Subunit: 119 residues, 3 copies
């Protein structure tokens, strides 16, 4: 669920706040369109995609689904007690949070005018 995803990003990029990622580029934020502006935005495109696949499990609602995972020293893992929905949503979230820790954060790419950069 949404809070768990915010917590995974805390596990992996403790220095940044959730809101630095929530409105970044063309994809980290509601929807997405265009070509990802950089590698971080590319992480977001892969995550919007992954949620899309997860949503084909009937009744699987990514932002509301509570799953089971563990953070240990910057490492993330999805536990075995997850049902199929919970296991897919958790996997989407941990791959995005790991991806965000390895991308450079470009401040010029936060809160961009989507109308001019993301066709």
């Amino acid at each position: 669920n949404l809070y768990q995803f915010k917590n995974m990003i805390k596990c992996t990029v403790p220095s940044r706040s959730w809101w630095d990622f929530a409105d970044y580029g063309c994809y980290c934020g509601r929807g997405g369109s265009g070509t990802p502006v950089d590698d971080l935005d590319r992480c977001c495109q892969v995550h919007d995609n992954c949620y899309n696949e997860a949503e084909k499990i009937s009744g699987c609602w990514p932002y509301f689904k509570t799953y089971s995972y563990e953070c240990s020293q910057g490492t993330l893992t999805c536990k075995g007690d997850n049902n199929a929905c919970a296991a897919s949503v958790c996997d989407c979230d941990r791959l995005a949070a790991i991806c965000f820790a390895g991308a450079p954060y470009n401040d010029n790419n936060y809160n961009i005018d989507l109308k001019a950069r993301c066709q």
Copy 2:
């Protein structure tokens, strides 16, 4: 709930995405004010007022209420097993998804700059 409404719009308007509707006109987004810029936006105004009505029943929280419905070949039905709030929120959404498939989508009305047109 929010995801079910998204899926009802996938049932009637398979060609468009939720985000196409989420920032359209003066009402389809967060709130609403002024004169519906067209017939799609008017579907949203009607949806906004139906949720206001639904919120009158104690503890009826429309975005969070899971209800029961069926999508069969582009047809939506709110099935009878679910309680007063559930029944009502289902009907609000059903009617809005039907309405969206009937109205034309004016691409020049997506994310209008609200101060100028919704007074």
Copy 3:
């Protein structure tokens, strides 16, 4: 949870809608950054902070947590049946709703260009 925060604002400032606050200044919406534009925006900044403290309780998810409170003609109380998470989220909410009632509402600070005045 978010509908209960909406109803607390209705107890305290019955003459305004939820949406007048949802998009005000630098803080009242999603996130926040910058210098609070006025006393109402400062109420929101303190509330965003209060939620970050409440989120330090494991599993305490402010928008989703249902708590128990009473609205008695403009006064609010968080009731004693709340567990620690619910009591913390209720208090954040309560204090923000009381703060909103004592602040002047500035129509020119509604839905501002965040880029120009909040970073």
